[PDB]
Design a binder for these strands. Sequence first.
RNA 1: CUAAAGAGUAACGGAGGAGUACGAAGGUGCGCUCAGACCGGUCGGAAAUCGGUCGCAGAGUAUAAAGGCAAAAGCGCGCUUGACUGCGAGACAGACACGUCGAGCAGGUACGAAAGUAGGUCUUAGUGAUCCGGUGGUUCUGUAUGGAAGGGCCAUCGCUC
RNA 2: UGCUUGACGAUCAUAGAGCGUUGGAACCACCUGAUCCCUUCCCGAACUCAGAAGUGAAACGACGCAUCGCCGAUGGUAGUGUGGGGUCUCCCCAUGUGAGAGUAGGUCAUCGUCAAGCUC
Lengths: 177, 50, 114, 137, 75
Amino acid sequence: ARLKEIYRKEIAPKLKEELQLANVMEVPRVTKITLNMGLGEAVGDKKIIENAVADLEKITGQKPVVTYARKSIAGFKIREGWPIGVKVTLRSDRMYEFLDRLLSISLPRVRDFRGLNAKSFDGRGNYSMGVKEQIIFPEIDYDKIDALRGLDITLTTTARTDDEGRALLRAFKFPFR
Amino acid sequence: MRELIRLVSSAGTGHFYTTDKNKRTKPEKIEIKKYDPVVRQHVIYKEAKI
Amino acid sequence: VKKETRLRRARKARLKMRELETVRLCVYRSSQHIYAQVIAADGGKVLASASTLDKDLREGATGNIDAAKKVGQLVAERAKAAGVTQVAFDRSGFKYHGRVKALADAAREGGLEF
Amino acid sequence: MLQPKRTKFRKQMTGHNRGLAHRGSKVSFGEYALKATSRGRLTARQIESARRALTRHVKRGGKIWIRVFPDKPVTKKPLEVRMGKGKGGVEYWVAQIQPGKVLYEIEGVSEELAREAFALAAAKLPLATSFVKRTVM
Amino acid sequence: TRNGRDSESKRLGVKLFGGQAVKAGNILVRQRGTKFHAGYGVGLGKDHTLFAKVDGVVKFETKGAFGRKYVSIVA
RNA sequence: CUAAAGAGUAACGGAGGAGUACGAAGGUGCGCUCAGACCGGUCGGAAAUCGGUCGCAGAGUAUAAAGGCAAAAGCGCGCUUGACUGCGAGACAGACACGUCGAGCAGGUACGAAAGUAGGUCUUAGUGAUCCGGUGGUUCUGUAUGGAAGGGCCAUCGCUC
RNA sequence: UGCUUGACGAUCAUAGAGCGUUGGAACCACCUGAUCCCUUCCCGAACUCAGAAGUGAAACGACGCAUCGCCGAUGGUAGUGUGGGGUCUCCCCAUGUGAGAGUAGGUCAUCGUCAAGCUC
Ligand SMILES: [Mg+2]
Ligand SMILES: [Mg+2]
Ligand SMILES: [Mg+2]
Ligand SMILES: [Mg+2]
Ligand SMILES: [Mg+2]
Ligand SMILES: [Mg+2]
Ligand SMILES: [Mg+2]
Ligand SMILES: [Mg+2]
Ligand SMILES: [Mg+2]
Ligand SMILES: [Mg+2]
Ligand SMILES: [Mg+2]
């Protein structure tokens, strides 16, 4: 990919001599980015569920799979087994191609870019971020948009402690605070 | 309730199996292979009203 | 680990070889080699074995389908000599496909009934 | 009035009372205790009366524990009702007492005061009791 | 609202104890679940009936990684 | 539960359920492992979907409880009809009538590469004798004879009897 | 001669867990790539295939340690068969039996078949 060889040849030798690691493969590495969309309002209409496939596939190039409720909640109008979301997983060079597109091309075109939270870590080196709205991704067409919807990004890395996670994330030139 | 049905052999024999069936959820007729002891072959049986 | 999920994936067939008192052609598959044991019904004794660690198979390719054919044909020769003809093929949780299938197919042509 | 405040079953079999109370026979918590030397039942009304007699006498200072809980429901047939036609309906709650069970405990008071307050409580109770000090093992 | 019902006793339990001679087909245990498990020469019925598949003597054994009580037929 | 550690065991004793369901929720091969908690994450909140750690069955098992459940007996997918026909050694249970389990043999299948597995469903409720009448088969009988009627035999239907 | 590694068993915690140290010659694992066989209700994550550039980081194996877990006496106690007795809702005596809990303590397993390497 455009970013895969960058990590393989320059970021990895940068981190090993930066984190003071005695092994080569101990360096934190992004394993996958998965894109979830919590599909609300599907309690009454299903026209949005295959609309979600349309936008989610185009910004990733992979066909998403529709998720279903693990339980039945009275507070919301959903029951076990209805489609209430979509998700995509990227691990190949497609994983790296999306990362550069989101980092350099997509992220700048947002309403109010105050950076990204640096404390947004689970505590085990995995970074999670959420996109407030759509149309940040250039792939879609604004005219050909049924509704305006968000989605979230999860950087699942092999880092042990979240300080390694931010170190690798900053090595990607991630805009933080 | 589950009303009784008759699975009648496709062969020339008058052999029939009997079973029940939910006639609202699945109103389509049952077609299934069962052993016909008259011709000693596995044969398709078709649902008929008992 | 994915080794634990494989052994428990192989438990049912192995427990079925016992309670049947059948001689088992156990198979192990690695990234570098592929093995084949002919284990007694009790499971605690091996009657014949063949791997890519044999003198005639250490050199050259060992972790491909071709090496599986040579090992499977070899274990058929040793099993017949040991006095074993009717076995049951244990895939040991490995999918019956590719190398594992090639080893078994060689034993089928080698004179092992399974 | 002590009650389990909810139960799995409303009614219980009468059962028996045969032990020697090898558990609940030590003075934990406090330093002086009222120990049952005989065997019987303690209703919730009796336990409360003994509690009130005991607490009123150690006025202004002390800590008191109730180590007897009436968790056993006891039924009664009404008057003018024949045998049969069901068990009968819970009337009160009792605690089964074996000899040796510690019923009440106190601390923060002198031994002379503790004996005085335990005599007051023991007169409300239908069992033979005794005064015991906390022991090392 | 009231009571007074019960079902018939099922006559479950061990029919042949340890060391008893068995013929093939003899019912060894009647049970609800598998309180006892089928060892060597012992079959399992639809209702988890343990029955003899071979002739021999009953052997009860507890063994395995799960602590299952087994019924086996030995010579 | 009472029920007294084999079985059984009464009370107008203490508590709950049943009078069904499913051609898939059956068979098989393959594959998987729940509940809950915490942390991070757009709407999203205690709780929706996503990722990670713990968790190790506290979930699930059509349904009441009890006993079971890793070869999961729980969950998914592909192909299917073994929810087969004749039987059946041997048992359990038992006043009788009924009832339960079942290796194995034959015929014919399904799934699997194969060993194998499958005669319904994790198990234990979901039921009603005979008579009479109806329907489908039948090499049986057929009141002088040939038929037929009617009868018998096998399958099956009609009782909140 | 013994050791190491791997596969399959015996046994099923005195065997487990946790923590720490160590192993890459071989084995194994991670690993490289995905056209080929095959796979994802998306994704070479898993499954599969062709390999050997890299590493023992993860996992696994070995070693150590009583922190947890597990095991656990002796003595006593409870219960209890039979015979007898009392103050008989419950106990006692003779005789036979005898826990559970707890205490002292113990445990970082033991064994077998086969294959490869090494040692002697
Ligand atoms: Mg009994
Ligand atoms: Mg008894
Ligand atoms: Mg949340
Ligand atoms: Mg929360
Ligand atoms: Mg089920
Ligand atoms: Mg005539
Ligand atoms: Mg007729
Ligand atoms: Mg790989
Ligand atoms: Mg290490
Ligand atoms: Mg102990
Ligand atoms: Mg003891």
